[PDB]
Amino acid sequence: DIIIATKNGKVRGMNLTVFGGTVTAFLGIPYAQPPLGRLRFKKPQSLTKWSDIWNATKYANSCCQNIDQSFPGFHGSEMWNPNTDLSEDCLYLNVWIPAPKPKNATVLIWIYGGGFQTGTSSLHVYDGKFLARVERVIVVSMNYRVGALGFLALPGNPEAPGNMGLFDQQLALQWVQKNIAAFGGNPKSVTLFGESAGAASVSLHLLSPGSHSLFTRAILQSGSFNAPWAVTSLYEARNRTLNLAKLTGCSRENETEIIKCLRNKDPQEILLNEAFVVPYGTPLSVNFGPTVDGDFLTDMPDILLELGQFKKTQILVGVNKDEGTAFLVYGAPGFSKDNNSIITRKEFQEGLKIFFPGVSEFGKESILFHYTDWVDDQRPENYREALGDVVGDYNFICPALEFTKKFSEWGNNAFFYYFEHRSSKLPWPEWMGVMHGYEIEFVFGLPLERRDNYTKAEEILSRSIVKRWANFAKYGNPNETQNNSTSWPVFKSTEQKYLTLNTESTRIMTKLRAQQCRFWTSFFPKV
Ligand SMILES: *C1O[C@H](CO[C@@H]2O[C@@H](C)[C@@H](O)[C@@H](O)[C@@H]2O)[C@@H](O[C@@H]2O[C@H](CO)[C@@H](O)[C@H](O)[C@H]2NC(C)=O)[C@H](O)[C@H]1NC(C)=O
Ligand SMILES: *[C@@H]1O[C@H](CO[C@@H]2O[C@@H](C)[C@@H](O)[C@@H](O)[C@@H]2O)[C@@H](O[C@@H]2O[C@H](CO)[C@@H](O)[C@H](O)[C@H]2NC(C)=O)[C@H](O)[C@H]1NC(C)=O
Ligand SMILES: *[C@@H]1O[C@H](CO[C@H]2O[C@@H](C)[C@@H](O)[C@@H](O)[C@@H]2O)[C@@H](O[C@@H]2O[C@H](CO)[C@@H](O)[C@H](O)[C@H]2NC(C)=O)[C@H](O)[C@H]1NC(C)=O
Ligand SMILES: COCCN(C[C@@H]1CCCN(Cc2ccccc2)C1)S(=O)(=O)c1ccc2ccccc2c1
Ligand SMILES: *[C@@H]1O[C@H](CO)[C@@H](O[C@@H]2O[C@H](CO)[C@@H](O)[C@H](O)[C@H]2NC(C)=O)[C@H](O)[C@H]1NC(C)=O
Ligand SMILES: *[C@@H]1O[C@H](CO)[C@@H](O[C@@H]2O[C@H](CO)[C@@H](O)[C@H](O)[C@H]2NC(C)=O)[C@H](O)[C@H]1NC(C)=O
Ligand SMILES: *[C@@H]1O[C@H](CO)[C@@H](O[C@H]2O[C@H](CO)[C@@H](O)[C@H](O)[C@H]2NC(C)=O)[C@H](O)[C@H]1NC(C)=O
Ligand SMILES: *[C@H]1O[C@H](CO)[C@@H](O)[C@H](O)[C@H]1NC(C)=O
Ligand SMILES: [Cl-]
Ligand SMILES: [Cl-]
């Protein structure tokens, strides 16, 4: 039998045959009390015990969330939709262990993204058996509440204080600290890693004092808290809570009555109203996400980062070459995943209004000016490409770079990557390039599965990324080998060196997109 004793009871695993070896998987370990009934909107409560041997042999329920149904049958979007029953009873986690069982393995904890409204640990691109098999690390991933059920905020009120999903993550980090040694793992070697909102989440755990001792090191893939979508101000969050009460028939004299009313609502009644809590939106809208709750976050995160009030440790940060394109076919006029999406200069300008609703006309004018200095005047795909880069630079690349600069300025080693390979199996059209989220499958080592129809070059690339991530986790240094390996230099605010990741060559380069990002940090805010 495959049985591990944990502080909350014994749990039964299952064997996976991986690359002619065995990985032991414990899928769907509860780590918190089910946030049902009176526990809805509260911080997660510690788990006491489950009754008998818990069978962690199938993934757990995913947290409640609206589904992306924009493209029925399309793998490109359905690969992100939850693949287990949705339920409010979702606070579970997964643990993959190398066989034979390690004595003190480094632990990698995955935090999925999904704009704080979606995601689940059970997606196939987050399958952790490959990393455990190939690098002999332990992999943990957890489900955390998303949407209003996860980030409804009445700051100061324990009935709905804000940042519950972040606290879900945190409680799972505490569970690893309490229990991972029984799975053979080193609680003193724990690396958080995640993508998009998960990366924004990792970046917020660097700032949260309660998480300081729950992990060693941090990997931020295509995301950071200073991205414009990631953190809502204290009273912007409160306002949206009130509007949800309004929209559901739960407006009440005092706040606890409002929360009382919202606990009576069906989950679908909450989920289907989440989109209407803001006056206007964008394809990158986070209606209920992290906020300044005074508990998980004691000040605006921008300030804590400025003042060095964060966990002093090593980080690995990076972005993808076409972060913006994904969001274009979700509300930008003239953009379809089924044509080559050539757009006019007028369609570009309409896209700016879609993605920048509350920005002045001269604000849009200067965005347009900064992104039209064409190398070749036509080149009929200039505006199509300009709009992607605007969305990608403003929402992801430039914030990730600025976070890395300011963080490295306080003395810890920081490593930046620019991932430029488009997957041979990427189901979206070619014009969308190296999309948001499509480095993940390489990080988790799926190209290592030869029966899966990736190219040999993608196996080598994924094998190299898998080595660097695991080496970063074990050693604070994302090295590959000492010899025959391009060195990954530290990111330093003067030189700002980064490593490119693709199949042709991995080069050290400097000041990624500095001319574009300089616009977004030092001019656009003044507008
Ligand atoms: C806080 O937010 C409200 C927005 O409230 C609205 O009502 C909700 C039910 C929801 O459906 C939203 O889409 C609505 O926008 C701000 O009030 C606005 O002013 C009036 C008051 O109802 C409303 O008709 C307007 O549409 C809102 N403004 C815009 C630009 O749409 C309110 O000002 C915000 N700030 C504070 C401090 O409360
Ligand atoms: C977890 O599953 C066990 C049974 O699953 C199997 O039995 C194990 C001994 C092992 O051989 C596994 O590989 C099998 O998949 C549940 O066990 C109870 O006890 C016996 C076990 O065979 C069974 O006849 C009983 O009917 C089970 N009890 C009940 C009330 O039906 C065990 O209950 C499962 N754990 C939980 C928390 O449900
Ligand atoms: C040592 O291995 C190289 C490949 O190693 C490349 O990996 C990158 C991450 C980076 O660190 C880089 O400096 C490093 O060189 C081998 O070259 C590969 O060789 C095959 C042929 O066997 C070519 O088809 C590949 O294109 C080539 N990859 C490259 C150049 O990136 C090579 O076998 C070996 N070189 C020596 C001198 O021993
Ligand atoms: C179901 O509820 C709708 C809300 N969003 C739907 C999104 C819209 C855009 C993309 N996809 C994911 C996707 C598709 C294809 C390739 C890669 C990635 C579906 S969301 O909750 O998922 C969302 C919101 C705001 C984000 C802000 C920053 C980054 C990601 C965000 C995701
Ligand atoms: C689950 O995987 C473990 C690890 O591979 C298996 O345990 C091994 O089985 C072989 C075959 O007899 C032994 O030589 C090893 O000594 C075993 N290891 C341990 C730690 O006991 C186990 O058999 C698998 N469970 C299954 C297949 O149900
Ligand atoms: C990558 O670099 C790190 C150093 O940054 C190497 O780490 C040492 O690793 C060995 C394991 O072989 C440990 O026993 C030492 O204690 C480590 N020392 C230090 C100072 O880190 C690591 O070996 C390198 N790996 C490769 C493949 O190059
Ligand atoms: C696993 O590795 C840790 C270190 O990462 C070992 O911890 C001990 O040694 C550490 C020095 O690096 C310190 O944290 C402590 O001196 C000590 N830990 C204590 C006393 O709690 C740990 O022993 C290793 N576990 C193994 C090998 O099973
Ligand atoms: C493709 O996308 C939509 C079709 O649904 C359309 O509005 C747009 O103009 C089309 N662009 C083409 C065909 O170039
Ligand atoms: Cl995502
Ligand atoms: Cl093209």
Author numbering: 3 to 529
From the paper:
Cholinergic neurotransmission in the brain is terminated by the hydrolysis of ACh, which is catalyzed by two cholinesterases (ChEs): acetylcholinesterase (AChE) and butyrylcholinesterase (BChE). The assumed co-regulatory function of BChE in termination of cholinergic neurotransmission in the healthy brain changes in brains of patients with progressive AD. In specific brain regions of these patients enzymatic activity of BChE is increased. Altogether, these data suggest that BChE is a potential therapeutic target for restoring ACh levels in the brain and thus improving cognitive impairment, while also minimizing adverse effects in patients with progressive AD.
The replacement of 2,3-dihidro-1H-inden ring with benzyl groups yielded type III inhibitors, among which compound 2 was the most potent inhibitor of the series, with an IC50 of 4.9 nM against huBChE. The most potent of these, compound 2, shows selective reversible nanomolar huBChE inhibition with a new binding mode, as revealed by the crystal structure of its complex with huBChE. The crystallographic structures of huBChE in complex with compounds 2 [-(CH2)2-OMe], 7 (-H), and 8 (-Me) were solved. Specifically, the positively charged nitrogen of their piperidine moiety engages in cation-π interaction with the Tyr332 side chain, while the attached benzyl ring fits into a groove contributed by Tyr82, Tyr332, Trp430, and Tyr440 side chains, in the choline-binding pocket. The naphthalene moiety is T-stacked (i.e., π-π interaction) to Trp231 in the acyl-binding pocket, while one of the sulfonamide oxygens forms a H-bond to the hydroxyl oxygen of Thr120. The -(CH2)2-OMe (compound 2) or methyl (compound 8) side chains point out of the gorge. This binding mode was not expected, given that the -(CH2)2-OMe side chain of hit compound 1, which served as the scaffold for the design of these sulfonamide inhibitors, is instead oriented toward the choline-binding pocket. Furthermore, a H-bond is observed between the ether oxygen of compound 2 and a structural water, which is itself H-bonded to Asn68. The inhibition constants of 1.29 nM and 2.01 nM were determined for the enantiomers (−)-2 and (+)-2, respectively.
